[PDB]
């Protein structure tokens, strides 16, 4: 009744360590030679490591030289493998094999017994971003990150991610406005964020404070967005086409109150020049650039002598709590995206608005459109992040 | 004067004992000579005589050092004995009954003839010995042999009775070169040493000259030995001919690779010759009476 | 091994001596041999040595005059002297040693390696001695002998033995013609010098008497 059992496998991020233990029952391990063989899906067996009868001489494969360490214990008749500095090419199922002849080491089909095997995986980065934004730039930045470090980056844009994320958790980094993030952190799905003091000096202080929660930080702010009118345009509300189903596009007209047609149809109508003035954020500007029609930005018109106050959002990215790639996500966010090159690459596809990065903010402030957007934003108020906004945006919807 | 049979039997026994004594040196030389036949990792697993021996015993077992011993024993029984008996007989024939003092040319000719006769008959043992010594489970081509007799059966059934004699010409060249170099170098060194009277004309001077001649002969014959080892241990259909192997070795690695395992080969040569000579003389003297 | 020499005797200056040394049995072909001489009242010294192979080795003070050889058929070592002088008068021994002991050319000089020593033979070369009575000029004879020794290398001494008339019945006997086959030197009587037949170096005595004496 010869039995071999393997343990220690699972999910591990890149640049980590793992302990694989092979235990033998029913035979005396004094005169057997232990070895480890990995198999990837769609490939045959490959050599990994092997040890002699008394731990005197051990051998390793050419591709795992200096990273893997093999050892054995005859008193507890077990074998151990230390895996260090893991790579995405190590995702495979591992088997522990015993050679009867003793003092032996060879290729497969020369051994006498085999084990069940354990799965070891190195998950890649998965980023969820709303389809409105320029996900192609994010994919390009992820490709650059993969070239620099060797870890793949995937970008997905599921429909209505703001409802799929709480149920699924799951993605590693989630991009959205800062109103849902307060509720997400209150429910516990998010993770605390600790950036360096030098890093916190790169962006504005109120931008950082907008994603704060009881003295902690739950997301890196990325950009500031606010609505604007696109078209002698009228100065007072008292022709035009805009999305009406979403309350976010109709709130500015409603607000002495306070809190505490479809988008595609309107975009198509304005792209052909059928309508004159449309109220929309910066992200749509590129589409107008593709329409080959002259257009200009303008502050929203006043109603009854009271200027409109559109809500101002802080597009920010948060790290999932259960994601096993916290260090990789932190490095990618703080070193690659929050830089002039990556932010410029993203903004080349679809403008974000006012980048919180001071170096890029100074350069982008020269565009009159950004100044007009900021002027419109100042007349508004930053929307709160209390956990009661999950239903409020629904309540105004109905 | 001992009869022919006594000389042959004593030579065979002495050769067998000498081969049994100092086989690991030959194993180390064979391992070092085939290190870079095919591309591999930049890390070299074998370096140094003691290092190679200890790595082999520590990784592949203690019985891997003496692999292919029966092939060596059969070679010593069938080749060495005839060589070192018929050498004396043919030398006496050439001298024609002590008619004249043995000249250098007569000894060279007798040695060349007996070496050619020994090399031509007794090649399969050398082929199987090289095949067994060069094989390893951990790295390289898959081991295809499970002993010595199984190697004979496999080569006879798969290849035939004409593939056993592969690489006889490199062996002939090696034997001729080693014999001529040994004789000429020893004679010249002894003559110069005696003429300049740096050392006394006794056995120390003879021994020193013999050692110098043996080292020079090993140094000269090492490249052909490397080529022979790389050609004999090669799957059929890979190497076209010996010059092709030489060109490949020169282009892939360089001239320095032509001198591999010189120290183990020289050590084996010296030890085997000394032990064989002493045992042969002692046994012949004991059995003559 | 019972190694025995032969060829002893007393000879005159300038002669050639043939010394043989042979062992018992037939073991001479497998041995190295050497000749060592001891002067009267002196320790042993290196003279010559021939190895089993057949390469001779000579000493610093003996090179050019000796000639050593060996005979396997006769199984003996033969030494030939050339231009022998009284300075080489000594007792000679031949020693044999087993091959393989020596490693250096100078190592032949050591006497410890050799083990089998023979009886030896005494070779003597008496020098010419001239007797002059007390009534003659012994100082002049001494000066002439010193000059002859410097010119050639043979010891010559002039003694003063009283009552030489009856004591004599040396090499050159100086006396009046009354007692006497001699060469006159001075006239008194006739003080003449005769060459006795007992002296071995008759030719050397004649050369001394003719070349430099009567001058
Ligand atoms: N003196 C002398 N040695 C020889 C001669 N031929 C071979 N040898 C040496 O004898 C030893 C044993 O030779 P073999 O029994 O033929 O074995 P081998 O496998 O050919 O020997 P290696 O070439 O040393 O691996 C080695 O040191 C040879 O180099 C020869 O003609 N003369
Ligand atoms: O439609 C309700 C929705 O409005 C806002 O969502 C915005 C988002 O902030 C913008 O970045 C962009 O994606 O347009 C969205 C509307 O389609 C609120 O942020 C959100 O809380 C609210 O549910």
Numbering used by the authors:
A (entry chain B): 4 to 172, 177 to 238, 245 to 251, 267 to 283, 286 to 290, 329 to 466
B (entry chain A): 10 to 298
C (entry chain C): 5 to 173, 182 to 192, 229 to 236, 385 to 411
Could you give the paper's own sentences about this structure?
Here, we present the structure of the human UCP1 inhibited by guanosine triphosphate (GTP), solved by cryo–electron microscopy (cryo-EM). Next, we generated two Pro-macrobodies (PMb65 and PMb71), which are nanobodies fused with maltose-binding protein (MBP) via a Pro-Pro linker. GTP binds deeply in the central cavity of UCP1, with the triphosphate moieties positioned to interact with the positive electrostatic potential at the base, generated by R84, R183, and R277 (the arginine triplet). The ɣ-phosphate of GTP forms salt bridges to K38, part of the matrix gate network, and to R183 and R277, which are contact points of the substrate binding site in other mitochondrial carriers. At the cytoplasmic end of the binding site, the guanine group forms hydrogen bonds to N282 and a salt bridge to E191, and the guanine ring forms a cation-π interaction with R92. The considerable interactions with the nucleotide constrain UCP1 in a pose with an impermeable barrier at the matrix side, explaining why proton leak cannot occur. The cytoplasmic gate is open, and the residues of the cytoplasmic salt bridge network (D97, Q100, D196, K199, E290, and K293), the tyrosine braces (Y96 and Y195), and the cytoplasmic insulation layer are not engaged. The matrix gate is clearly closed, forming an insulation layer of ~10 Å to prevent the conductance of protons. Thus, GTP-inhibited UCP1 is not in a pure cytoplasmic state, as the carboxyatractyloside-inhibited ADP/ATP carrier, but in an intermediary state.
When activated, the protein catalyzes proton leak across the mitochondrial inner membrane, dissipating the proton motive force that would otherwise drive adenosine triphosphate (ATP) synthesis, to release energy as heat. UCP1 (SLC25A7) is a member of the solute carrier family 25 (SLC25), which all share a common structural fold. In contrast, purine nucleotides bind and inhibit UCP1, regulating proton leak by a molecular mechanism that is unclear.
